[PDB]
Amino acid sequence: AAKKDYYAILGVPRNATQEEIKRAYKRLARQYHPDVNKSPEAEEKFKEINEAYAVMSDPEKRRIYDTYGTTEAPPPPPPGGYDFSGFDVEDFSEFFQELFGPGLFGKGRDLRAELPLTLEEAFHGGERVVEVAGRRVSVRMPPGVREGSVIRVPGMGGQGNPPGDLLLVVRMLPHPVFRLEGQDLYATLDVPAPIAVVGGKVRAMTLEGPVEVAVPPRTQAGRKMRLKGGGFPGPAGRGDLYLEVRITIPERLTPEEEALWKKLAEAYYAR
Amino acid sequence: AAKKDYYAILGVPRNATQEEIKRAYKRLARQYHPDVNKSPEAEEKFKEINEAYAVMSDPEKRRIYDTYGTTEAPPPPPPGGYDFSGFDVEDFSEFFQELFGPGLFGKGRDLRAELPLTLEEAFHGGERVVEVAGRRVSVRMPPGVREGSVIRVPGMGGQGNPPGDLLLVVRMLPHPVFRLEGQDLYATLDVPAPIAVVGGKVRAMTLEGPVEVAVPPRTQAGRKMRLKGGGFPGPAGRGDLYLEVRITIPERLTPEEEALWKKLAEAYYAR
């Protein structure tokens, strides 16, 4: 209740410098430290010294204390609260609690947020700047990150003593062409009917870019083709790419091309 | 309330034999039977005879009727109760309800079972014979009956006064070709590539039978074609059939056919 004299406790004058306070703390802390001084009186003196230094080491906190009493009631807290890092704040005197209490909060809560990513964003990974309701955060993201993968950004959660963690959970945006299942990718490969019969090379697509795919002679619709290592990356191994063959036909032709298609069609009505 | 004379209703002497009661029932049952006698008076008379015979036919039940009213040893109804299977017990008089009431069981438990049906079986509906627990049961069935549909067969449940009900739930067996969704049907239509380009007729399938489906010129794979009313029937409406076009190519060809396919293929590598 009664205003503690932190200056008397550290044995420094009312107008001491910060370094004067620092060295006074060092001198007195080594004097009353639990494992150097095994006295019952030393426990309380050490506690006092730590409380004194906790307030006086910060110029901002030192000023609050200096201008307390003339203005009777405790002052409004700063945004966020008071930061007494490396100080057992719960063990300090009642005077302290009355004075700094309004801005002494408990363990900060974690914030859990979704990280909506496109197949190619998650595939590459790398550095992503994330703005999720509250703060701007940059994080490293492993190549081939999946749905429900947790990215912990420590200290970026809720405000408190200490602050909480940001927990980002990856969500996968549906893709126009590819379909993810585990580490494997699945896509439809359009193969022109003549190329399917004879067997040639079609231009297909991967997330890395476009590749050439050789289709064997007489490959039917629904034939699944594996491109080893063309799927999602992973720590222990890489997934594959599966292309499902989809026979395609020309929606437009030249009068010359009609003659060829007509002969085949007639041979089908024959069979 | 008053003691009914069952001997007077059946037309038998006070000390008749069990065979004499049986033949007197047959004589009077065929005289006042529902479908042979269309009289309003025959309704009560036939109910009277049914009440009499039910009591009189069983020697244990008949003795109970004979020894009722007198100031002798008062017998509580037997541990097993009274068996009146095949008689509208509640419909009977109160005199019957007072003497046999304590030995009667309540309405029987419902028997619950699954009715596994194929798409074609569910499509057509009608009369079905089913085995549940031990017995066979006939059951009418609406065309286009669906998954989870309840078919209450009254009086075909557990033993009781009256018996309970059979409750069947329709389960749909998976089909090799058709897929049900609501009342709509879905299936894959194989279409030879040359027919898809030029446009012609393909032999498609329904649950009724096979049909001809006219395919327009230049119809791409994935084109979905509605066959009105070709789906599942129902009250107030009929489902559609949807056939998804799947372009097919020949797995075997003639040396003459190779040349036609080879030309188009080389015109595609050129494109």
Numbering used by the authors:
A (entry chain A), B (entry chain B): 2 to 272
From the reporting publication:
DnaJ protects the cell from adverse conditions through the prevention of protein aggregation or by assisting the refolding of unfolded proteins and is an essential partner of the chaperone DnaK in bacterial DnaK–DnaJ–GrpE chaperone systems. DnaJ, the bacterial homologue of Hsp40, stimulates ATP hydrolysis by DnaK (Hsp70) and thus mediates capture of substrate protein, but is also known to possess chaperone activity of its own. T. thermophilus DnaJ is a typical type II DnaJ, i.e. it lacks the zinc-finger domains found in type I DnaJs such as that of E. coli.
The electron-density map of this structure inspired a third construct, this time of a complete DnaJ from which a disordered stretch of seven amino acids (108–114 in the linker between the GF domain and C-terminal domain; DnaJΔ108–114) was deleted with a view to increasing conformational stability. Therefore, a full-length construct was prepared that lacked the 108–114 stretch (DnaJΔ108–114), which was shown to be functional in refolding assays. Moreover, the J/GF regions of chains B and D showed poor electron density, also indicating flexibility. Since the J/GF domains visible in the DnaJΔ108–114 crystal structure each assume a different orientation relative to their respective C-terminal domains, it seems likely that this flexibility is, at least to a large extent, concentrated at the junction between the J/GF domain and the C-terminal domain.
